[PDB]
Amino acid sequence: KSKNHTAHNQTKKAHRNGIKKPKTYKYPSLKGVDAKFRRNHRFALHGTAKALAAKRA
RNA sequence: UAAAUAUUGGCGAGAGACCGAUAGCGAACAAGUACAGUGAUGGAAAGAUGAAAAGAACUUUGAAAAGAGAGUGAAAAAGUACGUGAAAUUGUUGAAAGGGAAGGGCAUUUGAUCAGACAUGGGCCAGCAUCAGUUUUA
RNA sequence: AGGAUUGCGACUUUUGUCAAGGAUGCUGGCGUAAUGGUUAAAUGCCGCCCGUCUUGAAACACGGACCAAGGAGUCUAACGUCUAUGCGAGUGUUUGGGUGUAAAACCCGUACGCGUAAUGAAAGUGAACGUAGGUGAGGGCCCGCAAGGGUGCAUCAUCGACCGAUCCUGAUGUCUUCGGAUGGAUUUGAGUAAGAGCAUAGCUGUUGGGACCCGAAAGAUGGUGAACUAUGCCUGAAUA
RNA sequence: GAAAGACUAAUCGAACCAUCUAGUAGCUGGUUCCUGCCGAAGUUUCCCUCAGGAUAGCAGAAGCUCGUAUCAGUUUUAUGAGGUAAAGCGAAUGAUUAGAGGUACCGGGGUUGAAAUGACCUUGACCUAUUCUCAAACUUUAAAUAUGUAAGAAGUCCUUGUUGCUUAAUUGAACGUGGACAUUUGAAUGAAGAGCUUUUAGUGGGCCAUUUUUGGUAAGCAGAACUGGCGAUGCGGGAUGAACCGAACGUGGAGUUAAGGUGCCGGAAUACACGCUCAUCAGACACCACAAAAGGUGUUAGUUCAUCUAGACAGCCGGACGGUGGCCAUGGAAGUCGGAAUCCGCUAAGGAGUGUGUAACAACUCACCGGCCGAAUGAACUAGCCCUGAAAAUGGAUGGCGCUCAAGCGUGUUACCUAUACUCCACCGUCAGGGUUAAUAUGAUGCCCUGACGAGUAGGCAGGCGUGGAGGUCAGUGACGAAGCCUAGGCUGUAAAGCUGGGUAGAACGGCCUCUAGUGCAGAUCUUGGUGGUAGUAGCAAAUAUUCAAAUGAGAACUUUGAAGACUGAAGUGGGGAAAGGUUCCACGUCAACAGCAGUUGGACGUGGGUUAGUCGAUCCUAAGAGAUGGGGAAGCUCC
RNA sequence: GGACAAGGGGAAUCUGACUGUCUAAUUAAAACAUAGCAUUGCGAUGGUCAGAAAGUGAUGUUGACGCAAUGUGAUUUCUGCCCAGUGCUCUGAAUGUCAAAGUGAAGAAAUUCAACCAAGCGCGGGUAAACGGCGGGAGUAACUAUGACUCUCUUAAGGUAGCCAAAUGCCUCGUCAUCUAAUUAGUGACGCGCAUGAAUGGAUUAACGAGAUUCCCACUGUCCCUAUCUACUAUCUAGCGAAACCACAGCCAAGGGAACGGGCUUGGCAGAAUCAGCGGGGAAAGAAGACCCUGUUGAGCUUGACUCUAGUUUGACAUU
RNA sequence: UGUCAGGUGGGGAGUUUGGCUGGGGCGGCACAUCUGUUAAACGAUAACGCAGAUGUCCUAAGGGGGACUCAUGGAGAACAGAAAUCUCCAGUAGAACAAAAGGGUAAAAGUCCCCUUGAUUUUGAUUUUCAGUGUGAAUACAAACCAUGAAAGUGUGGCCUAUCGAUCCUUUAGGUCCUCGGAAUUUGAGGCUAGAGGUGCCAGAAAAGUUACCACAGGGAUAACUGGCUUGUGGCAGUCAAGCGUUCAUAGCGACAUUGCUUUUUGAUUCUUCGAUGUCGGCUCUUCCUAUCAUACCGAAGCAGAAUUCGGUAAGCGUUGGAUUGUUCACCCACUAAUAGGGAACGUGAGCUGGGUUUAGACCGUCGUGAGACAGGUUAGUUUUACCCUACUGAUGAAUGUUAUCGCAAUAGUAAUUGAACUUAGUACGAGAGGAACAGUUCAUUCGGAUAAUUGGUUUUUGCGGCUGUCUGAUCAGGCAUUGCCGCGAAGCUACCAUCCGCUGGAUUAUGGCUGAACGCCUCUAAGUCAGAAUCCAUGCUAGAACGCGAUGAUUUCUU
RNA sequence: AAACUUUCAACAACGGAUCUCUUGGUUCUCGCAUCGAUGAAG
């Protein structure tokens, strides 16, 4: 007796509000990245902080 | 074993941004009355003439009720079927229309009726000419 | 349409003139029911009866004979976002006391609620390596004639630091089994990082309440009926 | 309960009376004043979910950080992915028609000397090269249309820092320090400002159209895909119609067109040009309201083939034999039951023969050729409009009348009619972008300028109109007339409404700034009260029956008296009581209502009068029953 | 029997014996009752039944020729077979199971694990005028049906006497005979009978029946075929005077449309005001469909549905 | 007797007794999942669409390394054979891989041989269904600890796509852990971190029937009656023509194929109506359709005549009486000119009937433990209201100067019907048997309009006469018996139960002809034209427009 | 042409809305404790 499924006035609804791109940023989210790489990457950024501090003198 | 605490009942006093007679208690009036049911119980409607009854003497028509006059009063378009007296709904008179309904909207014509700055000394309705804006036709 | 002038122009020998940022000039009739307004009828064309549930109503779908008055999202206890007001690391007088022109207005302060610290089931412990850290963007201001450089609040992204839990590591010491130094980890929190909240009032939304208004077949507690009719007992009557 | 779920005070498959109770409802019906701006959904996932909720989506409101940004339901250049339409089977997988060859090593049936470790037959057994047709769940190959990424300052290269990662390493990899290159911000077009956050309404039954498409004989049937509509939407056209064609709407004026039309109804050519059709059932405009196979010398055009200086068809006559009865067959076949031969002569021409006919001949007749006559005819086909095929029920529908070298059908060329669409001007509102008290009176909320837009149910927000009370203020209005009510009088506002003339009537009531609510009605088989049409209508008909005079009275079909007719017929319309009523009995007065006509009468209305017991009843005794006490239960009302 | 008053009759079939009784206001019967027949329980400290409880009740002013609880339904005549299943019952054999209290062992105690164990269920016997079933399913063959032997499926047994297309038979309007001109009817026979059958009573049957059904005699306006008469209405007048219903109203055909218009569209047409009749329409009035489906709405009845319970019965402790 | 424990206990109490669904119910699972396709060349995508699978099996069929090639065919080897084992040649997979189906794999992911437990531990990130929640599965690393190989490497179960499960409760593993809040010690209980015990309605209540005695709230979101769309099925008709028909396709028939029409069969569907449109037949009455049974007039025949068969224009006119059944339909017995088929809300219930279906009473059989059920059989069972509007049938009537006579006819309606006898004639025709017709006479059938002299019926003429019972004293003469009964009975009314009456011209259809082109002939025809049928139109009959007309008669006092 | 039907106005009917009034209600606060065998409530 009842109607099952349809896709009428569905794409028409979506284009009213937007259909938008996902923004994008500089410095993306560093998640799901290799753990061995990240540990060494932390020590590199710690060491280079000492370098720039000594230069400004 | 007192006090600070309770109280839609009873007796006595104050108030209200509460209702205004289809409201407010069921009940502003002879209301738990009239009335219904065998019985437990059920349960209405109904306020207002005028300051004062001064509540209409007397004539005349009628078997009488009443009617016409008169008289009271500021008023009887206040007469105890009573302040004001709306609508549905009815009678009379006046105006209009009517060949299987009426009743509406736009625009005129005729018939009715009605506002609005010519008064001081004794505005309304058109026509022609030269221009501007938009068009049409040789 | 507009209602002093301002502009662009053109023609001018020149002054000025002009069709150039929206109509001026001249003339006649009437000055009132004539023009207009409402109202009734006639004529041309057009017009199905509202309210409602529905994909769909003029409907052979439901409610409506007619009129008057009454008649339906209200108030409260906890609350959320937004907005106005007062004070602001605080805020809130009104349980209660003092006073009074007496349910008012005015004054008073111990407490107590929320906020100022979190995270763990709990025992418990408990937020600065550095200008409260770097990088990218950033309004505004500063220097400069400009090009450009300097300083960069709010906020957004991003990698670090700190506090708690979790899992390892286990220093000097020491009731020899307590104690937890320091260093770490693809884990983890409604955290810290120069505080924002508390009180009153308003629209809208939420949950309990009769809960926008009317509407069941039922269920439960405590009572009244055998003058009708069902059946038995006692005592009478009636049938050519 | 002699049994039917019967009866139990009009109530029974579980009585009635109050209270808990305003019981609960995913279900039905109703839900009260105006303009202004924006404007939906019937879909995804879960649910004792399918008439219902949550969750996302769509919508409004409030805005915040910024001011041409790194954006777009689009195109182009560069570059990826796909297995549909078509295509293919002498290409796999599976299906399938017809021969030919190789046969050879072989499985078999025969025929040939029972013969065959031998031939030739149908043969398989496959094989070899060919040939006809196929496929949603087969494929080598392979479009269109849709679809992913890129077209730069977060850029391209040069330098040298950082470490516990990585390297044989002085390598690499990430994140950097300083440096070079801005006209030419390194395709097109547009930009109505861009990005972001909170919060909450309605909705969660959908339906129709053009293509794609599954089930089904098919359906105004069921079910999907992509855009567009209706629902929420008027306006011009399709006669009429939710959806089709054209177009989307503030209030008016002038022009011009869309779709569709121009004999009349009806505004606009009884225009112009070339054809076709005549129907005793003509035809007439998309979706749309129907028609087919098969046929016609009705008429119109065309294709392919034939004969033509006598056509040849006509269309009327002349011939149609000689060998010959050809061989064969057998009762007999002589052109004519048949099986094959198909040849000559004379020839203008005559088949060893088209049929009729006969037992077989005879006889007739064509094929082919002359005789008469003098210019185009014969066959087979294709499509146009008309006709046959074509039968349903009340009378009937190209919208109607009517139309025939059309007012019909096909095609062309011009004019003309006309929508709320398009262009231009007036006025209204909403939104945006500006300019301004620099003393310079009257509202800075002011006073101006410029530009765009206007449909709308469910829904949300904004700005106003009115009703009952409260605080303030106009030293407001009023018995010289407040409130209310009536009025084919007038004025203002888009409107909710407000102000005011005339009449009626006789005590209170308004404006402006704020507070507050039992604050606006046409619907609910709404509640209470009142009044209509229907209508002076339905009807006032069962118990056999009334009539004549006289009196009283305003008045007599109906009261009182007389006379005459009648009935009940003593199980009665007679004479007395029981239950039950309660003054109805009786007298005098008297008719406003009641006695469904009337009324002088009355069981009506007003004012009085009336029931006398030692013996008649009650009182007294006991019946079926009821019911204290002594006792025993029960928290107790009270029970035995 | 001159008015008045006053039985129609006959031959059958189904069914209940009869007289009697009930659904008050749609069912008067074939239903219920009944005499007769049969079964079950009880010797008073008892059976059946009431009450919240009692030093309390009904049967009972009773005592088995009685009281209580059921089935069948006068007389004549018969009541066949089957205790596997489901009930009921027993002086059946036990130890298969099986509560609290008590008994013992372990432990520091709370607890724990052991045997021991009442009725009642399991195990065995009895019972069909207890509830019920009494079917077929296969085959062997004498002769061209033959009815004697075997087994065994759902458990135990396999329809005996009887009766029938019967109120019990689907296929059907069965086949044969009879009644009629003609019979889906009626009666009489036949019977592997979907699904007859023995006190859940079978077969028969005199009298009786506002019971159901078929035919024959007499009788007739039921009918061919209608006609006429009488009273009381209707009709007209005087007086009195309502209700239902009602958006607005009232002429048709076709079209399209929520697919059957009184209003929209195109045609036909169209003349004040009215009175008797009548039943074609107004999808005419009556009543928020009783049939059907939905609702996470109910109630009445039933049962090896789920969870309880009064009563009763067995055991332990107290009264002791 | 009291308290506690075990059995029994529909005697009574409370409550439930799924969902989807071309109505529901019975079936089935489309209700958690997986393969191919439908699905329209990215992804997404429906139906109780199509072909099929799963609730498991495995210490090896898991993990690593090393050997080696399978289907099938051909040629050879004692028993040995189409098929045992042995050897060589060809061999792109045509095999095998735990199962459904698709993909994948050849010094392997197949087959055989050696060693083992990566089916291990601690936790997060990530794809797929998706609210970007959970459940299930799958992918890529970090820190560990192992296996295997000379190593590089590979391995966090099954080559890949399926093979499974919250809260609360119970239970097991783990730790020199935390808590029992007056302080301690041992038992005991409660916590923190990961497994197991299951919800198949699979995001997860704990649950049997029946109601014909029924109830409420709703639903045309949804069945039973019409109507509409559709036509498979039912019914009626075409096309081509192998054969049948002694001979001969089409006088009449007609296989194998194929195009249609119709809504009087039955299905399909669910748009209208559930705050009700009164559902089966019969009785009564009107009108419409033609797909014609009869009658009128014609054509064809395997038509001699009679009878019959096929077709044409035709709906003018007619279509019956009975037995059985509730019947529609059916089947018989007759008659007849003939006993054709249908529609109108499956015409017709405020028109009737109530036998049927269809409520409650009751009986029988089969089924059910039981209440009860049965598209089985049987018997008894309630049929309301018109006074309104239109419609039809009759009847009055204002107003056109007033009144009265005598007429015309617009339009509407219309009617006649069929047979038998005598004669023609026992003639035509025919071997016979049989056996017509036109004209001409007389009568009937069904239908219609009047009429009452006669016959019949009716009798309140209460006209006359008779008879009972009672009442008025008797006799005479009467009353009552709801018109007392009985016989005769005028007037009126009335009956195929009685009598009379019911017209004749024109134009056409089918069809058959004349003259005659097209097409030098022929031809019923194209132009023109003769006959012709129950058809049509007049004549005749019925009403007379109340808004259609005409002709004629008389037209008002002396208060003025 | 009248009657009849429908719409409006003036006067007259029907009926009791509207407007103004009010010895009654309703809520809140404050004070006090008094039935009966001497025969109460009803």
Cα(A6)–Cα(A10) distance, rounded to whole angstroms?
9
- CB–CB of A30/A38 below 8 Å? yes
- CB–CB of A50/A57 below 8 Å? no
Span CA (A44) to C1' (F195), Å: 44
Decide: helix, strand or coil at residue A35: helix
* Strand C footprint, Cβ within 7 Å: A 25-31, 35, 38-39, 41-42, 45-46, 49
**Resolution for this model in angstroms, one decimal place?**
3.6
- For chain A, how many residues are written? 57
Query: For the CA atoms of chain A, what is the radius of gyration?
Result: 25
Q: How many CA atoms lie within 13 A of A56 on its CB side?
A: 4
Q: Which residue has the tokens 């290799």?
A: A34
The answer for A32, left when phi > 0, alpha when psi is -120 to 50, beta otherwise, is left
Query: How far are the Cα atoms of A2, A13, A27 from residue A7, in angstroms, in the given order?
Result: 16, 11, 39
Q: What letter represents residue A50's amino acid?
A: K
